[PDB]
Curated annotation (Swiss-Prot), chains A, B:
InterPro entries: EBP (IPR007905), EXPERA (IPR033118). Cholestenol Delta-isomerase and cholesterol-5,6-epoxide hydrolase (ChEH) activities are inhibited by tamoxifen and the selective AEBS ligand (4-benzyl-phenoxy)-ethyl-N-pyrrolidine (PBPE). ChEH activity is inhibited by oleic acid. Belongs to the EBP family. Changing I62N: In MEND; patients have increased plasma levels of 8(9)-cholestenol; probable hypomorphic mutation. Pathway: Steroid biosynthesis; cholesterol biosynthesis. Keywords: Acetylation, Cataract, Cholesterol biosynthesis, Cholesterol metabolism, Cytoplasmic vesicle, Disease variant, Dwarfism, Endoplasmic reticulum, Hydrolase, Ichthyosis, Isomerase, Lipid biosynthesis, Lipid metabolism, Membrane, Nucleus, Steroid biosynthesis, Steroid metabolism, Sterol biosynthesis, Sterol metabolism, Transmembrane, Transmembrane helix. GO terms for cellular component: cytoplasmic vesicle; endoplasmic reticulum; endoplasmic reticulum membrane; nuclear envelope; nuclear membrane. GO terms for biological process: cholesterol biosynthetic process; cholesterol biosynthetic process via desmosterol; cholesterol biosynthetic process via lathosterol; cholesterol metabolic process; hemopoiesis; ossification involved in bone maturation. This is 3-beta-hydroxysteroid-Delta(8),Delta(7)-isomerase. The chain crosses the membrane at residues 23-43, 53-73, 108-128, 172-192. It catalyses: lathosterol = 5alpha-cholest-8-en-3beta-ol; zymosterol = 5alpha-cholesta-7,24-dien-3beta-ol; 5,6alpha-epoxy-5alpha-cholestan-3beta-ol + H2O = 5alpha-cholestane-3beta,5,6beta-triol; 5,6beta-epoxy-5beta-cholestan-3beta-ol + H2O = 5alpha-cholestane-3beta,5,6beta-triol. The gene is EBP. Its EC number is 5.3.3.5, 3.3.2.11. Residues 48-191 form the EXPERA domain. It comes from Homo sapiens (Human).
């Protein structure tokens, strides 16, 4: 093999093995995500719901900087730019096909980065008890995230898990299954939350 | 050409020209859709929302019966089955690729048939008792439909409108653009409705 991308018949010229090791990307972003969680917990102070605000901040970050970075540079994917493009190449060492510039994958990433990022930051802004749209926004964003993620899983699945080595501990179970499963589980609860409160908002209107 | 499907280099074996003309299916759908609109206007009476409710009923039909027929009986492509198969073959004479069994198209149709249909029926049925989940469900359904439709357009666009003859009056501008623009515009207005109502329902809690 001349490259890790696992549909092994892929003829990927113009491929450059990343200079920075995988632990560079994983650790540097875990660190920046912690920084955002702390900064947003403080700005919230200025219990669980105050955590959900940091969740929505980390969302807006991933959707805008990272998932948006893919939306722009899904054609180059050569490590001469910032380590974000290398991040995406490493995620592609995981299951999916973010190297080939998949028709569907580009579209779903474009939508989540254009809408759910801004709207997630609008959730964290409008949740400081300032606007009635706080749970409507939570509901819309989390429903959209659930849709995007379920379509991502279904599409890659109906391809028979073609892209990416099946069962791989690092690349399949963590990169593919776990990271994405977050935007399946966490916003699901949030939908229920946004539903359980908005139903109450509908009941008190009497 | 041995088929109208416009990526004309498509070699489509095991293809059977529909026995029933197009007017068969057109009338068979006109009658039943009118029947549903009438029965639901009656059950609503027994102002505007009584129309929107039958809209949510007609949705429940198309998503469940028609789009469900597609989700099941691809890729047989035999007009010897019910007039649903001829319906889908005629729509595929239009732009999109409901002949090829497109990965994304099948996945999106699976989600809209499994989720948005039932949920639209839950809106129209549970909208009779003024239940508090009604504007939440209306919002969720219409947001999901908008997501499905935006991805439906975007993917074909990044495919360069490959499937289907561009600009064709019947097949592209009516079948492709208009029919989907329906589920882009009408549930958009419904999103706005449910949002302004839930904002008012959220404002009163003080
Ligand atoms: C720990 C680094 C990381 C990653 C990452 C995970 C594995 C390998 C490489 C990178 C990340 C990247 C994209 C992502 O969205 C994938 C799209 N699917 C959801 C559809 C979710 C997580 C990350 C970056 C910022 C905040 C939190 C995590
Ligand atoms: C005019 C009768 C019709 C049809 C139809 C359209 C073109 C040719 C033949 C039949 C229909 C069929 C499928 C459909 O789903 C397409 C949207 N998805 C791709 C998102 C939307 C409309 C129809 C269906 C339900 C209610 C009212 C009319």
């Amino acid at each position: 093999p001349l490259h890790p991308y696992w549909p092994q018949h892929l003829r990927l010229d113009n491929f450059v093995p990343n200079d920075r090791p995988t632990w560079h990307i994983l650790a540097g972003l875990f660190s920046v995500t912690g920084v955002l969680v702390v900064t947003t917990w403080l700005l919230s102070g200025r219990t669980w719901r105050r955590l959900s605000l940091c969740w929505f901040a980390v969302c807006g970050f991933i959707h805008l900087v990272i998932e948006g970075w893919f939306v722009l540079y899904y054609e180059d994917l050569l490590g001469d730019q910032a380590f974000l493009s290398q991040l995406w190449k490493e995620y592609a060492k995981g299951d999916s096909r973010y190297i080939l510039g998949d028709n569907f994958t580009v579209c779903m990433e474009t939508i989540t980065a254009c809408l759910w990022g801004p709207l997630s930051l609008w959730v964290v802004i409008a949740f400081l008890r300032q606007h009635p749209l706080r749970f409507i926004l939570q509901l819309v964003v989390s429903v959209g995230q659930i849709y995007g993620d379920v379509l991502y899983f279904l599409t890659e699945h109906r391809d028979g898990f073609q892209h990416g080595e099946l069962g791989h501990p690092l690349y399949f179970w963590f990169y593919f299954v776990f990271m994405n499963a977050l935007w399946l589980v966490l916003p699901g609860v949030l939908v229920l939350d946004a539903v359980k409160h908005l139903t109450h908002a509908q009941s008190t209107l009497d």
